[PDB]
């Protein structure tokens, strides 16, 4: 709730001489301009000085913390690096199994890129911004032609921009790719300085956002797929897309490992990068690689496919963004255990998903989501559950802890500042009643209002669960999903605004697994 | 009111220097900072020169008191420290049912930890805070195994933080306990100062906040069940819960006493300290204790179960925290007298209950409330009855003395901060008023809910002859109908969703409901 103009006059409070720059102000630290102040929440941070925390910590820092020390060294000096190695079968094995046939040791060297025997795995190390010791490792197994990625430490503390040290401040040009191999390719052959994000196309944590600063042209490359364009789109959002360029998806853009691996030049695919930001009148010219995308991937046109809803899967034909649906039933039914397997089956193929959980105890809510994750009863398994555990926390999921906030203000600043902080791409709030706290009539109208608004100007979707529809909220709603009972019950969808398709299905609930089903 | 800045300007208004700290602000005493008033209720207290009172006290002690002596010194002279015990099947048989097996004497001698012969009871002195004599003796008897509690003086003045001369002023970490033994461990291997609430989990009164102060960061540990979280989280929130942190209760996170006893890594626990406060945001890592706790104690996720209405107890299935409970009926069967058992029965279980009664003449309503407490006529029972009221006088209780709807609700919020109040209860909301009627009901029960939701604690309302509307608002509906025969229907439950309705066979010889 502190807006860009406070934390200037805040600033003008200390007479702090700043710049305004692309998104994090810049002013010299008083604890060249080393201090970052963040446009959104404030989350200070010092080129050299390294201090960070809350504005509300900065406004108390004017007045009058970690380590993340971990076992990491160990397994870094039980490992080889790729270009030092003597060996002739096992580096071929190596290079065939991750796809490095082009790659030669000249970028090896240059991206310190280490190989580990036990596992045989690739080893991207990680470098504090002062030039300290290594900070984390992220490893990379190949198995069948699969990549798996799992780093140290947990992924919602993976915050590396690979190759950080190594751009230099006379940069203005860097390309950002999905992965950490496709960057080595990328760097091999144009020359220019390139970054990788995290987590790859999930989230790009605000904290990362002022090493990026000094850069005045970025050009996306995220991968190969229309989900990753709308990926791109929404984290160009934090930077001020008119200094970001995007590459569009299609058959001749390939991702920077496959381009240089098949020959392609990848200067060529360098060159076409189209803006982010355009007038309110567009031509054609922006929106060839699209329509050409969309007309060779006509099952990407449409949002992501379930796991676990094969029958569901048939009748709103995906999950795509901005779009918001409104999800009713009578009560006793479980229907906010039903959600709970919709938003979990799709968060675990990259979906950050926010549980706005009301007047459901969310810590009860934790266990009926854990138990699907386990797809069985936890009850009886408590001896093997210290291993789903740290399953459950790499999945991007967040809950809203509202005490006694209940005003629809409140309730939506956090959900903007959700989206801000850790990419929230998917909202679900339990109760509407709850956020209230013809009057009624008019109050339901207001709210369901409200988030339509929120819906398509944030681009996040939203799957609201109504507790007793409303023949006002049909209008404004893209799509209704109705669970009705005759444990068996049926889902009916009355509205597709994407593709008018309607239709009802029988549901199979079993409660020893908390999972439905249908035979 | 207070309002804290008000406090401020007061204080500007002798212009006193003052720094505004965790809770209680602290400034130059004027009667190095030592005059320290808290953030509400001002409740005075210099660490020098040792003077208490209320806020309109200072207010006088600006413009122009106890002893506490008790024969507790002949008690403490008749006892023996266990360090100091030549005896050899006498200490084995007390460590055994106390379970000192791993304790050494090197920390006995730092508590001061002294033992007595005629009732084998552990000794665990309180000094005062100016390093003057003895303040108190708490005593712990094990009977079977069981630890009975019993202090000098009456549990409702026992204010003493075991070790606080202990710990010094050089120290930024420490780690509280709801007994006295655990907190011995924990020092043991640690290392780290250590504290003891005065009667455990029950209640902090605000008077041992200013010593708690200058400590940085603090780390609740106050038992094994989800009863013990819960406490902590109220008990935080008086300090605010930016500086404190908590240890969820689990199977492989024991009380400190046991913790040791067993041979787990009480340091290692130390450091999983997930901090109570946390942004409008969360993700699972600060809630895996919780579903796991949850999940391994099915039974601890509902409230305490009540030891007089087993009836009641299949179908409410807990007294939690935070919900809101409206009871009603038809007048005459003394629904009045009802509710009187059924809080004594929670009350005496470790449950600080405030009682609101309004136009009854609460006075009467003690007399209703000790009978139900002897289970059976105390007129009869006259001249065994000042034993009663030393029994009586150790729950936690607190009675309203009377009329707006914002000066009572003051006073509540007031009462949940002074005492720790987990439970309020008012007999007539028809006297707190002093289709208007219809709005007017409406509008206090909206309040209701929320100081309910806000503060977590637990209201039992009472409606004098129902309201559609109250059903949305409230949680928990209790029905007592009459066909002394009774029988109560319940429709509402947020908890489980679980209705139903039981016969009530009423006896005016001992005050008690029963059902055969």
Not at 80 to 107: C, H, N, R, S, Y
Not at 228 to 243: C, H, V, Y
Not at 280 to 306: D, P
Not at 443 to 461: E, L, M, P
Request: glycine share 6%.
């Amino acid at each position: 709730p502190v807006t860009a103009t406070e934390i200037r006059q805040y600033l003008r409070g200390h007479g702090i001489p700043f710049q305004d720059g692309h998104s994090c102000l810049r002013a010299l630290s008083p604890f060249s301009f080393s201090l970052f102040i963040d446009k959104t929440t404030g989350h200070f941070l010092c080129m050299t000085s390294l201090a960070e925390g809350s504005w509300e910590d900065f406004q108390a820092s004017v007045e009058g913390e970690f380590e993340d020390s971990e076992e990491v060294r160990r397994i870094w000096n039980r490992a080889i690096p790729l270009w030092e190695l003597p060996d002739q079968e096992e580096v071929q094995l190596a290079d065939t199994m991750f796809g490095l046939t082009k790659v030669t040791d000249d970028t090896l060297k240059r991206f310190s890129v280490r190989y580990l025997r036990p596992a045989r795995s690739l080893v991207f190390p990680w470098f504090s911004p002062g030039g300290s010791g290594l900070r984390g490792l992220k490893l990379l197994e190949a198995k069948c032609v699969s990549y798996e990625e799992t780093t140290i430490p947990r992924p919602s503390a993976y915050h590396n921009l690979f190759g950080l040290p190594l751009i230099s401040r006379r940069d203005a040009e860097v390309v950002l790719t999905s992965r950490e191999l496709d960057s080595l390719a990328l760097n091999q052959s144009t020359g220019l300085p390139t970054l990788t994000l995290p987590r790859g196309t999930t989230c790009l944590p605000p904290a990362l956002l002022p090493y990026l600063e000094q850069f005045r042209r970025i050009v996306f490359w995220l991968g190969d797929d229309l989900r990753s364009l709308e990926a791109a789109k929404l984290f160009a959002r934090k930077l001020n897309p008119k200094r970001c360029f995007l590459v569009r998806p299609g058959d001749q853009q390939p991702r920077p490992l496959e381009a240089l691996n098949g020959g392609f030049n990848l200067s060529r695919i360098l060159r076409t990068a189209l803006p982010a930001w355009h007038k309110s009148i567009v031509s054609f010219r922006q929106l060839r690689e699209e329509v050409l995308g969309e007309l060779s991937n006509v099952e990407q046109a449409a949002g992501l496919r379930w796991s676990r809803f094969p029958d569901l899967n048939r009748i709103l034909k995906g999950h795509r963004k901005g779009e918001l649906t409104v999800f009713t039933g009578p009560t006793g039914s479980g229907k906010t255990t039903f959600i709970s397997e919709y938003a979990l089956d799709l968060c675990s193929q990259g979906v950050n998903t926010l549980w706005g959980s009301f007047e459901i105890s969310n810590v009860r809510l934790a266990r009926v989501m854990l138990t699907q994750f386990a797809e069985g009863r936890l009850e009886d398994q408590l001896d093997k559950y210290d291993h789903w555990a740290d399953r459950f926390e790499d999945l991007p999921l967040y809950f809203m802890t509202f005490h006694g906030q209940q005003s629809i203000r409140t309730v939506i600043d956090t959900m903007q500042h959700a989206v801000y902080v850790y990419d929230i791409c998917h909202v679900i709030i339990d109760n509407l009643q709850f956020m209230m706290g013809t009057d009624r009539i008019a109050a339901q109208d207001y709210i369901i209002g409200v988030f339509r608004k929120f819906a398509t100007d944030n681009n996040c979707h939203v799957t609201l669960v109504i507790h007793p529809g409303s023949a006002k909220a049909s209008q404004e709603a893209d799509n209704v999903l109705i669970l009705q009972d005759r444990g068996k019950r049926y889902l009916q969808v009355s509205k597709n605004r994407f593709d008018g398709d309607v239709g009802v299905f029988p549901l199979e609930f079993n409660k020893n697994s908390l999972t439905f089903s249908i035979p």
